């Protein structure tokens, strides 16, 4: 239509004296036209045009004002000294009428940056509360843009934003709730308060419902303090308003992840909610679906089926038919697959071009995804090869072949062989590469390789370089794997085809010379089956889904080992007792992502305990350095050393340790409590993940106590015969004490309490005791730190409560004393 240069240029007159609202407005229209028609502005002339226009803001005409808003936003980024236009926009923005109000806030806020943010706020507060949708919605979207430049200004507007939220007017609410969710967010909980306020309400605003559904879709039970249900009384889990999109979004989330469970007037576990909307017009597309559903997509699938299946079969309209395939695909599942496959077979008949490729891929893809047997997948993959013969590709040769060598290989090659009979050189580089690669790699004894070779030999002549090169190298590997083959390799390679073309020659000269001339140490080594060049995943199935309706390694296996590894890096802990075990009951001192996350584990050594404290400073305003967790033992333990966490910045874990020595004569338990306080140096930080200030202050954060149990000292085992082990460990360290467990009225619980506390597995599966028997003998075994066995015998008497005489024997005085004390 227009020329960008002439129009950008003539705009410069505004900058001088002429303001002429008609002429300038036209010139502006022309700018909008240059963009719209599709053109790109030249920067010098743009920069000039922008400074000129600001003069035009003096004249207040509604059409000129309008031109001015669109033109400055489009020209804003390809212009300089734009800042002048802010004042003019504020002047316009306060002027009453929707033409100015709404369009200005949007143009102003786009140009506005954090410095300028402050200016627009009075006018913004006035514009947001409006139940006149233009002014309010433009102001609400405007605030969203402004969250970037400066967050804090926008946040103050949360009250005006909320005020708009209370409208049932669709725009004012959609914008209000949507924006609010973004704005007020400083934690989940404050947003959740905003949502609960609207939540109990039966809106007539579908957009608000939708934007909110998304916020809601996850279970929120902290909305406005707390509440006893994930409840959403606005359609998400409810079905207060029917309207097929909202109904679909809501129904797929709620069914197997309740936003609330099913109500008689609002299904929300049952499959129903989608289905009542399901017979419909074009509208049906949302309605008919599924996704998730109780307990599977399949009972759901049956409802809707008439609709999806008739459109999919009948309509050879692309627009309908696509909705019908997506809808079939959605009502699908593992079960559904029988049905889904016949339909997809049928579908290509309506739209057959790419759609053909897709259905032959889909039937294979569905068989791989939803199991109807891996074999059937191969058989479908043959049908794909047959029908298209060329829309298979290179990625198919690699994917078919890799997939095939899971089971199919002998068959696949053979099928491929037959498939190769097709068409000599229009079959493509890829099929020849597949029969060639497979015949090379398997080295057929399932069928005679001579047919395969004869088929491939012809294809090579008239097809691309990459296959002819493929054919020589394959032949060489084929030689190395099977001796028999060598005579065919020679007739093929001497030919002008499989060698002596171009690329084919170079590869061949190498491959040939290595087979012919050389040892074939290399050739032998090279064939490991004669496999592909790469093993990807199973690419086809996802591709197909969209297209149709258009080494974790480990050391440790035990808590002691993983901790032992962590400990081992540090010297002191392995140098001063080596680790018998680490706790089977590690206790987290301070909860996750609050102030600190500290998890401590107590590790036992031959004569020591090391406490590993994994410390996180989740303090947004700080970053920590030289952090240690300090300890006060409540019994006689010596605290030898502290190992610091070098730094703990915001949200970054670090580990600190305290090594203490264990008593080895203590008459009371090694079940003991340590009071923990982390001390550290704080340097100020701007929350990101870390950043330290030039100077800072000392600060401390209090932590929970760490409890060490007898369970940490002992590792559980059972014995085949307790009595022998029990005598064998040391009846010379034997001590006996009688306890009453009055809070345990039966033997079975009693055995469980001694077993858990001590960290001893009761022998011979003695946690199950004959219910309410007068006498019982409980056999305990486990190994104590240092590597010495500890056996405990508890002879239980059951009155109405449990009394036990617990006799313990151990290779030391300490386990005996420790167990006896801890139990009572």
The tokens for 566 are 């962590």
Q: Which of residues 324-353 bind other proteins (CB under 8 A)?
A: 326
Judged by CB under 8 A, does residue 355 bind other proteins? no
Interface segment toward other proteins; rule CB under 8 A; list 47-55, 257-265, 316-324, 734-742: 316-324
Report in angstroms how near the CB of residue 98 gets to other proteins at its nearest.
5
Judged by CB under 8 A, does residue 60 bind other proteins? no
What does the alpha-carbon distance between residue 666 and residue 677 come to, in Å, rounded to a whole number?
A: 25
Evaluate whether 656 touches 615 at the Cβ level (below 8 Å).
yes
Which listed residue (310, 338, 406, 503) binds other proteins by CB under 8 A?
A: 503
| Rounded-to-5 percentages of helix, strand, coil across the chain | 50, 15, 35
Judged by CB under 8 A, does residue 170 bind other proteins? yes
Which listed residue (337, 366, 492, 508) binds other proteins by CB under 8 A?
A: 508
How would you class 197 by CB atoms within 10 Å of its CB: exposed for 0-12, middle for 13-18, buried for 19 or more? middle
What does the alpha-carbon distance between residue 239 and residue 209 come to, in Å, rounded to a whole number?
A: 11
Task: Tell me how long the chain is.
Answer: 824
Q: Which of residues 777-816 bind other proteins (CB under 8 A)?
A: none
Binding footprint of other proteins, residue count (CB under 8 A): 107
Nearer to other proteins, 459 or 716 (CB): 459
Closest to 689 (Cα-Cα) out of 647, 654, 651, 646: 651
Report in angstroms how near the CB of residue 581 gets to other proteins at its nearest.
41
Output the 3-class SS for 449-476.
HHHHHHHHHHHHHCCCHHHHHHHHHHHH
Judged by CB under 8 A, does residue 494 bind other proteins? yes
Q: Which of residues 546-565 bind other proteins (CB under 8 A)?
A: 546, 549-550
Judged by CB under 8 A, does residue 403 bind other proteins? no
Judged by CB under 8 A, does residue 398 bind other proteins? yes
For residue 318, CA distances in Å to 120, 306, 746 come to 49, 19, 73
For residue 192, CA distances in Å to 226, 231, 671 come to 9, 12, 43
Q: Which of residues 63-92 bind other proteins (CB under 8 A)?
A: 63, 65-67, 69-70
Evaluate whether 118 touches 154 at the Cβ level (below 8 Å).
no
Name the region of 519 (left: φ>0; alpha: ψ -120 to 50; beta: rest).
alpha
Which listed residue (236, 244, 308, 614) binds other proteins by CB under 8 A?
A: 244
Report in angstroms how near the CB of residue 550 gets to other proteins at its nearest.
6
Judged by CB under 8 A, does residue 29 bind other proteins? yes
673 by DSSP, 3-state: which? Answer: strand
Interface segment toward other proteins; rule CB under 8 A; list 50-58, 102-110, 614-622, 805-813: 102-110
Judged by CB under 8 A, does residue 138 bind other proteins? yes
Interface segment toward other proteins; rule CB under 8 A; list 16-24, 339-347, 393-401, 688-696: 393-401
The tokens for 789 are 């066995």
Nearer to other proteins, 107 or 711 (CB): 107
Please report which residue ranges of 129-257 form alpha helices under DSSP H: 133-149, 151-156, 158-165, 170-183, 188-199, 206-216, 244-254
The tokens for 598 are 């500290």
Judged by CB under 8 A, does residue 499 bind other proteins? yes
Judged by CB under 8 A, does residue 285 bind other proteins? yes
Interface segment toward other proteins; rule CB under 8 A; list 285-293, 405-413, 451-459, 792-800: 285-293
* Run of H or E including 696: strand 696-702
Which listed residue (15, 23, 82, 98) binds other proteins by CB under 8 A?
A: 98
Q: Which of residues 428-467 bind other proteins (CB under 8 A)?
A: 433, 436-437, 440-441, 465-467
Which listed residue (54, 88, 90, 134) binds other proteins by CB under 8 A?
A: 134
427 by DSSP, 3-state: which? Answer: coil
Nearer to other proteins, 144 or 486 (CB): 144
Q: Which of residues 520-539 bind other proteins (CB under 8 A)?
A: 521-523, 525-526, 530-534
Judged by CB under 8 A, does residue 102 bind other proteins? yes
The tokens for 248 are 């679909």
Closest to 498 (Cα-Cα) out of 536, 524, 459: 459
Report in angstroms how near the CB of residue 294 gets to other proteins at its nearest.
20
């Amino acid at each position: 239509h227009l020329e960008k240069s002439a129009v950008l240029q003539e705009a410069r007159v505004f900058n001088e004296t002429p303001i002429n609202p008609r002429k300038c407005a036209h010139i502006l229209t022309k700018i909008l036209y240059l963009i719209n028609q599709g053109e790109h502005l030249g920067t010098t002339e743009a920069t000039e045009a922008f400074f000129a226009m600001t003069k035009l803001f003096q004249s207040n005409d509604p059409t000129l004002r309008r031109m001015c808003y669109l033109t400055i936003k489009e020209m804003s980024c390809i212009a300089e000294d734009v800042i002048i236009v802010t004042s003019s926009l504020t002047k316009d923005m306060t002027g009453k009428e929707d033409n100015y109000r709404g369009p200005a806030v949007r143009a102003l806020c786009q140009i506005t940056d954090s410095t300028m943010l402050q200016a627009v706020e009075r006018y913004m507060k006035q514009a947001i509360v409006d139940k006149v949708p233009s002014v309010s919605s433009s102001a609400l979207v405007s605030s969203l843009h402004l969250l970037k430049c400066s967050f804090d200004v926008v946040k103050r507007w949360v009250n005006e934003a909320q005020e708009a939220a209370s409208s049932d007017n669709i725009m004012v609410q959609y914008h209000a709730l949507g924006l609010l969710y973004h704005v007020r967010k400083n934690d989940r909980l404050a947003v959740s308060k905003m949502i609960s306020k609207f939540t109990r309400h039966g809106l007539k605003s579908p957009f608000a419902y939708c934007m909110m559904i998304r916020v809601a879709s996850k279970q929120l039970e902290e909305e406005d303090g707390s509440r006893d249900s994930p409840l959403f009384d606005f359609i998400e889990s409810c079905l207060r308003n029917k309207h097929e999109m909202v109904v679909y979004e809501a129904a797929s989330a709620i069914v197997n992840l309740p936003g609330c469970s099913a109500k008689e007037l609002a299904p929300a576990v049952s499959v129903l909610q989608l289905f009542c909307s399901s017979p419909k017009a074009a509208l049906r597309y949302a309605a008919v679906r599924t996704l998730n559903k109780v307990a599977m997509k399949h009972p759901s699938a049956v409802t809707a089926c008439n609709l999806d299946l008739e459109n999919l079969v009948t309509d050879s309209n692309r627009s309908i038919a696509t909705l019908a395939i997506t809808t079939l695909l959605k009502t699908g599942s593992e079960s559904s697959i029988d049905r889904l496959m016949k339909q997809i077979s049928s579908f290509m008949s309506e739209i057959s071009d790419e759609f053909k490729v897709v259905v032959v891929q889909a039937i294979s893809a569905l068989c791989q995804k939803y199991p109807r047997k891996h074999a059937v997948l191969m058989n479908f993959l043959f049908t794909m090869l047959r029908e298209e013969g060329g829309f298979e590709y290179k990625r198919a040769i690699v994917d078919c072949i890799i997939s095939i060598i899971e089971e199919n290989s002998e068959s696949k090659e053979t099928g491929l062989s037959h498939l190769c009979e097709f068409i000599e050189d229009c079959e493509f580089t890829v099929l020849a590469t597949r029969i060639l690669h497979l015949l090379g790699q398997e080295g057929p004894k399932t069928n005679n390789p001579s047919k395969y070779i004869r088929f491939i030999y012809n294809r090579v002549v008239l097809e691309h370089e990459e296959v002819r090169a493929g054919a020589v190298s394959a032949l060489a590997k084929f030689g190395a794997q099977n001796e028999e083959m060598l005579p065919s390799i020679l007739v093929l390679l001497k030919r002008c085809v499989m060698d002596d073309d171009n690329e084919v020659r170079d590869r061949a000269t190498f491959y040939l010379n290595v087979l012919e001339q050389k040892q074939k140490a290399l050739n032998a080594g090279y064939i490991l089956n004669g496999l592909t060049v790469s093993i990807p995943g199973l690419e086809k199935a996802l591709q197909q889904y969209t297209l149709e309706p258009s080494q974790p390694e480990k050391v440790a296996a035990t808590r002691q080992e993983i901790f032992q590894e962590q400990l081992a890096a540090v010297p002191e802990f392995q140098g001063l007792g080596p680790l018998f075990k680490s706790s089977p009951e590690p206790v987290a001192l301070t909860e996750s992502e609050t102030e600190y996350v500290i998890r401590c584990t107590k590790h036992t050594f031959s004569d020591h305990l090391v406490f590993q404290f994994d410390c996180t400073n989740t303090l947004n305003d700080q970053t920590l350095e030289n952090v240690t967790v300090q300890m006060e033992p409540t019994e006689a333990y010596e605290v030898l050393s502290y190992v610091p966490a070098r730094s703990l910045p915001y949200n970054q874990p670090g580990t600190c340790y305290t090594l203490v020595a264990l008593p080895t004569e203590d008459p009371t338990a090694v079940a003991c409590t340590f009071s923990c306080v982390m001390k550290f140096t704080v340097k100020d930080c701007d929350p990101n993940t870390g950043e330290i200030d030039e100077e800072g202050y000392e600060d401390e954060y209090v932590l929970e106590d760490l409890e060490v149990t007898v369970a940490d000292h002992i590792q559980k085992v059972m014995k085949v015969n307790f009595e022998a082990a029990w005598d064998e460990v040391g009846d010379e360290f034997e001590k006996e004490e009688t306890f009453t467990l009055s809070t345990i009225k039966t033997l079975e619980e009693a055995v469980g309490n001694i077993v858990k506390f001590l960290g001893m597995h009761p022998c011979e599966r003695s946690d199950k005791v004959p219910e309410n028997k007068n006498t019982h003998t409980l056999l305990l075994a486990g190994v104590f730190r240092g590597g010495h066995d500890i056996l405990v015998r508890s002879r239980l008497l059951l009155l109405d409560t449990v009394t036990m005489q617990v006799t313990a024997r151990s290779s030391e005085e300490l386990p005996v004393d420790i167990i006896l004390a801890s139990v009572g």
